[PDB]
């Protein structure tokens, strides 16, 4: 079992888009304050996930990367330029050399 990876099992409310929650404030399901320790109706916001090769496909570890391609006032850069269009000589062509 791999136990160096945690997941936020409990939180105060929903997460906004593109937000990373690192706070480890003790979740207080009940009305008794946790005061930094776990007591009655007090659980850690982060639960220790156990990764094992023996686990099923739905529970197997999966390295997942989400990408957010945001267009802004700055010029668009991240793409694969077409380029190609192998240069042709001795023929009237409509060239375009980087503008």
């Amino acid at each position: 079992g791999n136990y160096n990876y945690l997941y936020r099992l409990f939180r105060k409310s929903n997460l906004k888009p593109f937000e990373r929650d690192i706070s480890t404030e003790i979740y207080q399901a009940g009305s008794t304050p946790c005061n930094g320790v776990e007591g009655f109706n007090c659980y850690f916001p982060l639960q220790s996930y156990g990764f094992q090769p023996t686990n099923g496909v739905g529970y197997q570890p999966y390295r997942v990367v989400v990408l957010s391609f945001e267009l802004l006032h700055a010029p668009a850069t991240v793409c694969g330029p077409k380029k190609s269009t192998n240069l042709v000589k001795n023929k009237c062509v409509n060239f375009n050399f980087n503008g």
Binding site: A29, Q47, G50, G56
Partner: protein, 652 residues
């Protein structure tokens, strides 16, 4: 048109601004907590009930949060216990033993803490059926309802009875130093050897050195369980075990603990004409082998039923075969000819599971579980076990060989696994079978389907030139009757006997006087030698002496017959039920998985209704499965006496 709801600070502001408020615009007063509707030339106050404070988490919600947190912690803790259990069963070492102690104590302590933390949550006000079922399955205090001394005494006695049964050893009078255990000593001797004296002595010697020793322990075990049941608001310990089948909270599906008993009684009565003819034929064949030891009019000796308790009559097949010259259904030649292996057997089972419409199986099973014998440097349990370690882990621990039996057990363990993978979506508390007769039934029907000649022919196990004759079908029907229908009265009488002995209806000085007389009447099983009250013969079995409800075998057989018939109906198979096969039938797999995924999240009645079509446990599939057997059994017993004489005994 459309209107909104207005809200201001003070009633003076409301009066000054209600002039321009259009009709139909609701006005809410925060200061006065009042509601008004703008009517023509006025505003009418909307009646509001008593103030309801904001609940941060209702008592139902508090139970929901607690159950979710417990399940999240239970998944990791149970997986650690399960993997430690796997390590011990793969290799038995001193380090392996001690981590059972740590995992067992940690799991028990965690369960006790959560059960105590759940006991204050009331089940009456929670209308969530899944949440209520989780809480009641978590709040089962069991032995902890009594005092510490009483609970410790009951556990110590239970361990003592299990130890006595496991280490029960009998020594022959000729050689007192030479002694043997029940397994594999007494079991094999009384299953293969045909000597009446040797079988009679082992039957009497075991029930003497175990029955006499267990009689005070079982009696104190019975009363402690009965008093624990009373402390748990149960009439007897049998009622506590029947609580698993008990269903409450669901309209049209509620099942009481007394309904299980009456269904068992009704089903046994239906099987009684079939079992009577089966017993009569087996009785008749024993005269064909031993004409001067048993009488056809009387019952059959318990030790002469192929075992001690009469559990399985399969050992009597050689003594009761209708046509011994006809070969049995065996495809062992295909194994040696094609070099079949245990891994190939499981692969074919997975391929067959794919054919019937069920999805593939995880590869973690193959990389973490063994199938063949894991060498000899380590000791591994060869018993057929299927593992649900949790959080997606599913394994099987058994020294699987390449026998038809093993091919059935592999299917049986796959059937157990398929259930484990199916209710996995349900929460940890609900991540199990609805009752104790469902997981075994799925494995049994899988073994039954894998044993059909058509399935073997489809995958090549059976030669295409093989013919299906009446004698082979009759022998197979008799073999199934001895193995399954034969143990039905044994399960019926043993669970029944345990029911009223827990109910206290059997006085102490007459215990064996009832069991051995009832055995002769209802079932027609007679003890070869008389046993007085110091004997504890009914408790000599493993399950009764190890705190196990024996009604599982009867329920699982009733379920397995219903599932097989329902699968056959969905598979549009043509032919006898015993020859029915579910191969290449996506309807059978889909219908089976419909209740498999439910597990214990839904009541067992709903799970049963999903496939067969009703919540009842009628044995109509059993009669239909063995109707050709029943007609043949009636033909064989058309002149042979049918039934049994209660008065007759081998010693009389």
């Amino acid at each position: 048109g459309s209107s909104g709801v207005r809200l201001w600070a003070t009633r003076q502001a409301m009066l000054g601004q209600v002039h321009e408020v259009p009709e139909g615009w609701l006005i809410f007063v925060a200061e006065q907590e009042e509601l008004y509707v703008r009517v023509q030339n006025g505003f009418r106050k909307v009646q509001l009930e008593a103030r309801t404070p904001l609940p941060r988490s209702t008592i139902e919600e508090q139970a929901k949060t607690f159950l979710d947190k417990f399940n999240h912690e239970a998944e990791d803790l149970f997986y650690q216990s399960s993997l430690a259990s796997w390590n011990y069963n793969t290799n038995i070492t001193e380090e392996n033993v001690q981590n059972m102690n740590n995992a067992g104590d940690k799991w028990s302590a965690f369960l006790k803490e959560q059960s105590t933390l759940a006991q204050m949550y009331p089940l009456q006000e929670i209308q969530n059926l899944t949440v209520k079922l989780q809480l009641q399955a978590l709040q089962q205090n069991g032995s902890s309802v009594l005092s510490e001394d009483k609970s410790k005494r009951l556990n110590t006695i239970l361990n003592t009875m299990s130890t006595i049964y496991s280490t029960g050893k009998v020594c022959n009078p000729d050689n007192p130093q030479e002694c043997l255990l029940l397994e594999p000593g007494l079991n094999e001797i009384m299953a293969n050897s045909l000597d009446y004296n040797e079988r009679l002595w082992a039957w009497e010697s075991w029930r003497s050195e175990v029955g006499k020793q267990l009689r005070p322990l079982y009696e104190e075990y019975v009363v402690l369980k009965n008093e624990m049941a009373r402390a748990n608001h149960y009439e007897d310990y049998g009622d506590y075990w029947r609580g698993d089948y008990e269903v409450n909270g669901v309209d049209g599906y509620d099942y009481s603990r007394g309904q299980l008993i009456e269904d068992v009684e009704h089903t046994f009565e239906e099987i009684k004409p079939l079992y009577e003819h089966l017993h009569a034929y087996v009785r008749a064949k024993l005269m064909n082998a031993y004409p001067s030891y048993i009488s056809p009019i009387g019952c059959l000796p318990a030790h002469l039923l192929g075992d001690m308790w009469g559990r399985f009559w399969t050992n009597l097949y050689s003594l009761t075969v209708p046509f011994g010259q006809k070969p049995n259904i065996d495809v062992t030649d295909a194994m040696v000819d094609q070099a079949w292996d245990a891994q190939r057997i499981f692969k074919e089972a997975e391929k067959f599971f794919v054919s019937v419409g069920l999805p593939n199986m995880t590869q973690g099973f193959w990389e973490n579980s063994m199938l063949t014998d894991p060498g000899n440097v380590q000791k591994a349990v060869c018993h057929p076990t299927a593992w649900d370690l949790g959080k997606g882990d599913f394994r099987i621990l058994m020294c699987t060989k390449v026998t038809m039996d093993d091919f059935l057990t592999a299917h049986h363990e796959m059937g157990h696994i398929q259930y484990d993978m199916a209710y996995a979506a349900q929460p940890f508390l609900l991540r199990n079978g609805a009752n104790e007769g469902f997981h075994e039934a799925v494995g049994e029907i899988m073994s039954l389907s894998a044993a059909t000649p058509k399935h073997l022919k489809s995958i090549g196990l059976l030669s295409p030139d093989f013919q299906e004759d009446n004698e082979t079908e009759i022998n197979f029907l008799l073999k199934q009757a001895l193995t399954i229908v034969g143990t039905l009265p044994f399960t019926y009488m043993l669970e029944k006997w345990r029911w009223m002995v827990f109910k206290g209806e059997i006085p102490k000085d007459q215990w064996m006087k009832k069991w051995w007389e009832m055995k002769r009447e209802i079932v027609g099983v007679v003890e070869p030698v008389p046993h007085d009250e110091t004997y504890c013969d009914p408790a000599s079995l493993f399950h009764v002496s190890n705190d196990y409800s024996f009604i599982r075998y009867y329920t699982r057989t009733l379920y397995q017959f219903q599932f097989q018939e329902a699968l056959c109906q969905a598979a549009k198979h043509e032919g006898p039920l015993h020859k029915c096969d579910i191969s290449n039938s996506t309807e059978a797999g889909q219908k089976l998985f419909n209740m498999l995924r439910l597990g214990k999240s839904e009541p067992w009645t709903l799970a049963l209704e999903n496939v067969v079509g009703a919540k009842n446990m009628n044995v109509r599939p059993l009669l239909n499965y063995f109707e050709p057997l029943f007609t043949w059994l009636k033909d064989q017993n058309k002149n042979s006496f049918v039934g049994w004489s209660t008065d007759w005994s081998p010693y009389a």
